[PDB]
Amino acid sequence: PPSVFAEVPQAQRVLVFKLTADFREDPDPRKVNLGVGAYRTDDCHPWVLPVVKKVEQKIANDNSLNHEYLPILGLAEFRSCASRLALGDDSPALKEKRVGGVQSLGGTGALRIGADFLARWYNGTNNKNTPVYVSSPTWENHNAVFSAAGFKDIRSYRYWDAEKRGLDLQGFLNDLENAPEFSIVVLHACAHNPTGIDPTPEQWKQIASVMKHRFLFPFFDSAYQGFASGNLERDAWAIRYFVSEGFEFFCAQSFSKNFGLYNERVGNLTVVGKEPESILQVLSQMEKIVRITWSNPPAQGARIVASTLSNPELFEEWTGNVKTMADRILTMRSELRARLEALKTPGTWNHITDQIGMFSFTGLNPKQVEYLVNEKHIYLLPSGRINVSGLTTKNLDYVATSIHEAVTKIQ
Amino acid sequence: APPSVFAEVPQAQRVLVFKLTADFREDPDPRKVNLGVGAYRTDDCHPWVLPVVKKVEQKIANDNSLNHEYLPILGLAEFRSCASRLALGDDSPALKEKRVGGVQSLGGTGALRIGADFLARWYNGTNNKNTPVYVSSPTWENHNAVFSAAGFKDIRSYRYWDAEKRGLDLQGFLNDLENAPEFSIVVLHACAHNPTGIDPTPEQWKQIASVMKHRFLFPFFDSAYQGFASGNLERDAWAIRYFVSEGFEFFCAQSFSKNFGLYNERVGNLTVVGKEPESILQVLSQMEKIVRITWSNPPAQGARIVASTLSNPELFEEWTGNVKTMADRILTMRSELRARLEALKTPGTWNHITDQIGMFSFTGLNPKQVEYLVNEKHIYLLPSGRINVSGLTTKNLDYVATSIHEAVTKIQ
């Protein structure tokens, strides 16, 4: 009698995971990991935000708190603070009570329960054939999350232009123009992962024009608000524009990066509708999905975010911490670009500073990446994506020289 | 203007406890009692943060070396091994033989969901959504929903509660297992059956295991009350550990919501026991894929509290003392309620009040009798007759017992 698990195969390995394992085992003293999936300081360390440390101390010393179940949809002050952060204090959607918020297990959890809701209630009853459009390329897990919710038809829209090292707007618009009516479109609100290149506001207006015409459902992924540029309002421009254009949409918010709270799993699904009463019905269906997935959400991370966003002094301290990370990212991009151009590297390198956020498509091809990894011990994905916060004052000259060698030696 | 894309979304109905609690809240009658809270409450009707949890929370807050970087997908390693070791026992042969895996999950619900998702994909075939899933009659209100969300199309009941004798219908239970198709999944309450409170005895568990072994039934244990149920961690895990020694492969969804009082930190563990070490590693690799598309990786704070407690002998002993305090109060409320009903010469028998264990009790009242308690005496409980025993207090015990006496004598 064989094990009931005897035929269970070994799951496919994750590229990022193996890359970091390879870096860890590398004895070369020049090695650099540009494939970390989180913010790191100039000393290659994690950074707990000072405001988070401060609030955690307050929480630990607050004997009025208990551990009883949160509401299914989550902590009320977190949900309202989170949605207001995305939409702005003066949002007409908030004033008109057309907004709901579901606390979730990070951005991933928000995407999941939103996809589960759409797969049951959107565009008909249990309609799993609604096309879901993701960017080419996109965050690895987008396809997997929507597939897990049951969607049978995941498609891509053109986005990264590898020749221009920038946004292929014409291809993006043409793919949307050919999307079946009511298709779901997964949009990066700001700091596109993995490329770092965002549509400009003028480009967003062209994108919204096609989506409005073909009744496409925007599903925003907002994982980097404030973290991307240091400016919360600017990083929310596209979301707030879609509000004012009258779209109904979902917005999956993560607080993993902009609060540094990765392992407390703090997210919010913001829902924007045309009318207040059906938003309440959406929320009641979201409760059913939550109850059969994680029952109700954890308190610690949401309590930190809610306390920060609702205290004006903590809020201003937080914005300072976020600007510290955004400023470091900005500086590493400027310094890498400057050194590449000083070395007379072929090609253009303004994309390094045109992009925003912690991830950058360098424009290197897989053979050039293989040179960096194998001969220079600089670890990055074959896609050419780097974590810009993996660059430091101490390794910048080595990384820029190695990229110069990769570009000049390898076609 | 065109209609909202949400215009046809109907209102979902909320769980019975929400309405019961709002009705209680809005009741102006000063004698009112809420016997339908879904968590432990003290003799003063308040929540209880365990002292050991307060102490460990201080330790965590003062540990400057902790960061917030993503945990591994399967969770905090020290929590997973401590949780599985808590359920299986330090000297478990499965642990020594490396036949065990553990997945940190979002409470017991999250563990049930991940395990159900795995079974719906890899067990009894590939993508077999037709494997029958058996749950007790009655059972925890979300068992059906969780396995249905995993895709299972055939969710069945096994007889369990006998309303006439106020106890376990072991013969009906065993006959339902005998007729189950081979490889059917059976969701078993490890201890402190929810909602009834009545558990199989160890000798009754041996008969259950015999049928399940003969019919190749898959045990999916729900272990939400270990230690909390009786105050003794070893006794509360006896059924699980007997299934290990009988050679079963199985899942066990563990919750630390009750026995640590960490309800809102969502601390659970899915323990997997298999025949062979290397297929367990492949099971875990598939659990990672499922976690990745559900919550990506699990939260740290509650797991850190449990891990810190279970890995330190001094904290573990404080914790077991705290757990015994809750178990002893529940045990006392049961004994006092029974003694008061028998002193009032209440018709029927009432040893089921003390035969049951854990926070929840099927009182054996019928819906007409419950309706009296709610409408006339303002004692709030579910139409099934389930009460939360920790809703009883030294102050309300005579009013509740007197009211149950009235209900039983006035209404047939």
Ligand SMILES: Cc1ncc(COP(=O)(O)O)c(C=O)c1O
């Ligand atoms: C675009 C994008 N979506 C979703 C996520 C997942 O975030 P979380 O870890 O909060 O689930 C990430 C990273 O935070 C991301 O970059």
Ligand SMILES: Cc1ncc(COP(=O)(O)O)c(C=O)c1O
């Ligand atoms: C039998 C049973 N299973 C599962 C659960 C769910 O536990 P959690 O809140 O940790 O998800 C409960 C909690 O009381 C329960 O009683």
